[PDB]
Curated annotation (Swiss-Prot), chain A:
Disease with which this protein is associated in UniProt: Diamond-Blackfan anemia 4: A form of Diamond-Blackfan anemia, a congenital non-regenerative hypoplastic anemia that usually presents early in infancy. Diamond-Blackfan anemia is characterized by a moderate to severe macrocytic anemia, erythroblastopenia, and an increased risk of developing leukemia. 30 to 40% of Diamond-Blackfan anemia patients present with short stature and congenital anomalies, the most frequent being craniofacial (Pierre-Robin syndrome and cleft palate), thumb and urogenital anomalies.
Name of the protein in its database record: Small ribosomal subunit protein eS17
Residue spans crossing the bilayer: none
Residues bearing the modification N6-succinyllysine: K19
Swiss-Prot/TrEMBL keywords: Cytoplasm, Diamond-Blackfan anemia, Isopeptide bond, Nucleus, Phosphoprotein, Ribonucleoprotein, Ribosomal protein, Ubl conjugation
Principal location listed in the UniProt entry: cytoplasm
Pfam families given in the database record: Ribosomal_S17e
Modified residues (Phosphothreonine): T130
Top-level lineage group: Eukaryota
Coiled coil: none
Gene Ontology, cellular component aspect: cytoplasm; cytosol; cytosolic ribosome; cytosolic small ribosomal subunit; focal adhesion; membrane; nucleolus; nucleoplasm
BP terms from Gene Ontology: cytoplasmic translation; erythrocyte homeostasis; ribosomal small subunit biogenesis; rRNA processing; translation; translational initiation
Swiss-Prot record, chain C:
Record location of the Glycyl lysine isopeptide (Lys-Gly) (interchain with G-Cter in SUMO2) cross-link: K87
Region (Laminin-binding): 159-178, 203-221
Disease connection: Asplenia, isolated congenital: A rare primary immunodeficiency and life-threatening condition, often presenting with pneumococcal sepsis. Most affected individuals die of severe bacterial infections in early childhood. Isolated asplenia is distinct from asplenia associated with other complex visceral defects, notably heterotaxy syndromes such as Ivemark syndrome.
Site (Cleavage): A113, F114, P131, L132
Taxonomic source organism: Homo sapiens (Human)
Portion of the parent chain present: 3 to 223 of 295
Compartments where found: Cell membrane; Cytoplasm; Nucleus
Annotated Gene Ontology cellular component terms: cytoplasm; cytosol; cytosolic ribosome; cytosolic small ribosomal subunit; extracellular exosome; membrane; nucleoplasm; nucleus
Lineage: Eukaryota, Metazoa, Chordata, Craniata, Vertebrata
Phenotype upon changing T52N: In ICAS; reduced protein levels
Gene that specifies this protein: RPSA
Post-translational events: Acylated. Acylation may be a prerequisite for conversion of the monomeric 37 kDa laminin receptor precursor (37LRP) to the mature dimeric 67 kDa laminin receptor (67LR), and may provide a mechanism for membrane association. Cleaved by stromelysin-3 (ST3) at the cell surface. Cleavage by stromelysin-3 may be a mechanism to alter cell-extracellular matrix interactions.
Listed name of the protein: Small ribosomal subunit protein uS2
Modified residues (Phosphoserine): S41
Annotated segments matching region Interaction with PPP1R16B: 52-111
Swiss-Prot record, chain D:
Disease note: Diamond-Blackfan anemia 10: A form of Diamond-Blackfan anemia, a congenital non-regenerative hypoplastic anemia that usually presents early in infancy. Diamond-Blackfan anemia is characterized by a moderate to severe macrocytic anemia, erythroblastopenia, and an increased risk of malignancy. 30 to 40% of Diamond-Blackfan anemia patients present with short stature and congenital anomalies, the most frequent being craniofacial (Pierre-Robin syndrome and cleft palate), thumb and urogenital anomalies.
Subcellular location(s) of the protein: Cytoplasm, Cytosol; Cytoplasm; Rough endoplasmic reticulum
Alphabetically ordered keywords of this record: Cytoplasm, Diamond-Blackfan anemia, Disease variant, Endoplasmic reticulum, Phosphoprotein, Ribonucleoprotein, Ribosomal protein
Residues forming coiled coils: none
Domain of life of the organism encoding this protein: Eukaryota
Gene source species: Homo sapiens (Human)
Example of a GO cellular component annotation carried by this entry: membrane
Name the record gives this protein: Small ribosomal subunit protein eS26
Originating gene: RPS26
Subunit-structure text: Component of the 40S small ribosomal subunit.
GO annotation terms (biological process): cytoplasmic translation; negative regulation of RNA splicing; translation
Region called Disordered, residue ranges: 84-102
From Swiss-Prot, chain E:
Function: Component of the small ribosomal subunit. The ribosome is a large ribonucleoprotein complex responsible for the synthesis of proteins in the cell. Part of the small subunit (SSU) processome, first precursor of the small eukaryotic ribosomal subunit. During the assembly of the SSU processome in the nucleolus, many ribosome biogenesis factors, an RNA chaperone and ribosomal proteins associate with the nascent pre-rRNA and work in concert to generate RNA folding, modifications, rearrangements and cleavage as well as targeted degradation of pre-ribosomal RNA by the RNA exosome.
Gene it is expressed from: RPS3A
Residues annotated with ADP-ribosyltyrosine modification: Y67
Keyword Ribosomal protein: yes
PTM comment: ADP-ribosylated at Tyr-67 by PARP1 in presence of HPF1.
Name of the protein this chain belongs to: Small ribosomal subunit protein eS1
Length: 135, 83, 221, 102, 88
RNA sequence: AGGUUCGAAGACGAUCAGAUACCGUCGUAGUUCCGACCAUAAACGAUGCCGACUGGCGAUGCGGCGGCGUUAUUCCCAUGACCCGCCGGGCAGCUUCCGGGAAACCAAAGUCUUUGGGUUCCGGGGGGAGUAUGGUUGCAAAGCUGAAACUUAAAGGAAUUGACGG
């Protein structure tokens, strides 16, 4: 009750995680020793407050991609972003469904009579336009 | 649109407007040859007619006056004439 | 163009019809009615693809006219287009801002991310109104991808395709990149581009994990 | 200065509307200005529904509703906390409050 | 009407709807049409029948209100009175 | 004529330091109808009337026109109920760096120092005062028309920050 960490602890822990992710783990005491020897923290209480938040943040990172950013998480992010170009295109449907109105649009721009272009009938209807007011 | 051309409108925009407010005003009404079954002659009923018109030979009703347009009676051919 | 070389070449018509890119209803903005063909019986407006193609080519001309390639700035607030603008900047050499646009990027000269571009290309006028307004502050011309109901306030080279579906957004960024690189000399314009347009498509996390587990179970078996 | 564009009432195309009486103080309010409220509360007051249900002589009986329409003057609606003061841009919002369904 | 020992024999005196049903039917954005007729049966039991009916929203209707115009209300009311009179 | 209910006046009961008040009980005139007066209201959109021009959007009411379909009689053409649009005249709404404005705001309160479409009424610091007096209308109550002496350095409008709010 009343254990919110200030922005000094939070941003110090974030920079520590960003720079020295490889030497930290989910153990408070080894993280405490690492933060002792890689940063000049003037007081013991601040030191192990920072170490506690580092431990909490590494549990969060081991769950998923919080900020961040780890090099492994970011390289796998750009791997997902860059790779999975599929082996077959998603736009090669080989059967394209068209309204007869779009068929006529293509017909008047000289492409409506050489493509595959499977056509349906128009929907008897005009029941768009969700009812006005409440219910 | 800043460069709408006001003196060459498309015919659909011309038909869409009021009968005034066109470049040159023109009526939306017309005349027509109305033919009823059982007779031989035709009558030249106005489209927006207000009179209960009658065929002079056979005293039968051709059109019934309504709010905007004369409603012709049960089945009778009509030919809009000279457009 | 009026040239025969800059004509439609119906392979991309098949790409357009597969992705969407011609269905934009049901609201029509009064400055976008120049680009529609007509309205479907179910309320959707149909967009004439000749106008889309030639507005795209005009935009590509304007992008090519910038001598320094890292002065075109490409913007996408939404994710469906964040991927496309990142790959577009990779292909052409533009400068992307994918995600949150911090206000004062173009006007506050003191701050660190003070970009000073010469052209601005925007996925959605309605979702990227803040870069449009700042472009009005710093006399910066603007190109945008516009649906049938997108307001054209600070837009100059509005390209009327579609910006709801992920496929249409990825496809139009793909063809903008292809035309920009073809007007410069990188692709000889006779054989198709090696980059397949699925590279620019948005992928939500659930279908990503479904695809990756399907690929894992296929590879192990 | 003029506080609202309508003058606190729905009177647009007419000269006079008939007054009504406020339901808990009997002030004369014009009908378009009054705070109206429709109440479809249960008679049997669902904190006590099970005792009535088990004491009933029928097997399948559905409890009747109570249908009252309330009219408030502005002062009674404010004091009974039917409505509250809002800021300017909040004032010009006409949506009913959400139905708190879940 | 009469007593037969330990029995009270009754006869019809009137019909009514419950309060909650009548309050449940009346709602906004529709027109209520009511009619009444005074009318005598063959054996001399002069009655007063009250009718009520409400305009119905169509299933594909997207307008909020279903309001009959005044002439429609008048001929609906005329039909109600003529049907009740011919029935009783 | 009629007087159910409410209810100026009035009486009482409370509350209060007081309480000719607010709250409660009763209750006259009045409230209702017919006939005759009176001419006033925050009689308000606090915005003269007529005409022209200048953005968008979605609805709504009346009339007309045109369209896939659904529904009613009836099996058809009408005619109704709905659906999708267009035109005209209405009551309004949202939005907009049209433009305006001291601003609140206003698509009119815009098209105004880049000042002139036609025309009626009307203001000229605050008070004294809509008073005095004369005239005139009315049964009266009052309405209309309407000063001066004298007095005064501000009275006001719209926004901002605080302080205060039973
Ligand atoms: Mg006030
Ligand atoms: Mg009034
Ligand atoms: Mg009393
Ligand atoms: Mg009186
Ligand atoms: Mg003065
Ligand atoms: Zn009250």
């Amino acid at each position: 009750m009343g254990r919110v960490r200030t922005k000094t602890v939070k941003k110090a822990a974030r920079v520590i995680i960003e720079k020295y992710y490889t030497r930290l783990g989910n153990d408070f005491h080894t993280n405490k020793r690492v933060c002792e020897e890689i940063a000049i923290i003037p007081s013991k209480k601040l030191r192990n407050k920072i170490a506690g938040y580092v431990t909490h943040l590494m549990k969060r990172i081991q769950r998923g991609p919080v900020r961040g950013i780890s090099i492994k998480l970011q390289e796998e992010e750009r791997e997902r972003r860059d790779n999975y170009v599929p082996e077959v295109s998603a736009l090669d449907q080989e059967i394209i469904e068209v309204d007869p109105d779009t068929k006529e649009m293509l017909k008047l721009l000289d492409f409506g009579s050489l493509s595959n272009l499977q056509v349906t009938q128009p929907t008897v209807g005009m029941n768009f336009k969700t009812p006005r007011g409440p219910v | 649109p800043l460069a709408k051309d006001l003196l060459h409108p498309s015919p659909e925009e011309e038909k869409r407007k009021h009968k005034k407010k066109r470049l040159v005003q023109s009526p939306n009404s017309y005349f027509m040859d109305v033919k009823c079954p059982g007779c031989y002659k035709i009558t030249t009923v106005f489209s927006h007619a207000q009179t209960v018109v009658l065929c002079v030979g056979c005293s039968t009703v051709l059109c019934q006056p309504t709010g905007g347009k004369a409603r012709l009676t049960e089945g009778c051919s009509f030919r809009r004439k000279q457009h | 163009g009026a040239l025969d070389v800059l004509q439609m070449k119906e392979e991309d018509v098949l790409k357009f019809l597969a992705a969407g890119t011609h269905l934009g209803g049901t609201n029509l903005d009064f400055q976008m009615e120049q680009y529609i063909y007509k309205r479907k019986s179910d309320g959707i407006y149909i967009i004439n693809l000749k106008r889309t193609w030639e507005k795209l080519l005009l935009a590509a001309r304007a992008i090519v006219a910038i001598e320094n390639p890292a002065d075109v700035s490409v913007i996408s607030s939404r994710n469906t287009g964040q991927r496309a603008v990142l790959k577009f900047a990779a292909a052409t050499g533009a400068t992307p801002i994918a995600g949150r646009f911090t206000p004062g990027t173009f006007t506050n000269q003191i701050q660190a991310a003070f970009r000073e571009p010469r052209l601005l290309v925007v996925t959605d006028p309605r979702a990227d109104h803040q870069p449009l307004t700042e472009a009005s502050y710093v006399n910066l011309p603007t190109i945008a991808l516009c649906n049938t109901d997108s307001p054209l306030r600070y837009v100059d080279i509005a390209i009327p395709c579609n910006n709801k579906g992920a496929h249409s957004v990825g496809l139009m960024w793909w063809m903008l990149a292809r035309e920009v690189l073809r007007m410069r000399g990188t692709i000889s314009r006779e054989h198709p581009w090696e980059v397949m347009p699925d590279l620019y498509f948005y992928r939500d996390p659930e279908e990503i994990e479904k695809e990756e587990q399907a690929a894992a179970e296929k590879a192990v078996t | 200065t003029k506080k609202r564009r309508n003058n606190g009432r729905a009177k647009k195309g007419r000269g006079h509307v008939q007054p009504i009486r406020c339901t808990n103080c009997a002030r004369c309010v014009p009908k378009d200005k009054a705070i109206k409220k429709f109440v479809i509360r249960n008679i049997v007051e669902a904190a006590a529904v099970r005792d009535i249900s088990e004491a009933s002589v029928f097997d399948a009986y559905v409890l009747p509703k109570l249908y009252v329409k309330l009219h408030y003057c502005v002062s009674c609606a404010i004091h009974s906390k039917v409505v509250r003061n809002r800021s300017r841009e909040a004032r010009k919002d006409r949506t009913p409050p959400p139905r708190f369904r879940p | 009407e009469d007593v037969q020992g330990k029995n009270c024999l009754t006869n019809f005196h009137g019909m009514d709807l419950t309060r909650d049903k009548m309050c449940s039917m009346v709602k906004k954005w529709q027109t209520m049409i009511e009619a009444h007729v005074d009318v005598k049966t063959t054996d001399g039991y002069l009655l007063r029948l009250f009718c009520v009916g409400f305009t119905k929203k169509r299933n594909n209707q997207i307008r909020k209100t279903s309001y009959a115009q005044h002439q429609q209300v008048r001929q609906i009311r005329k039909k109600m009175m003529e049907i009740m009179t011919r029935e009783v």
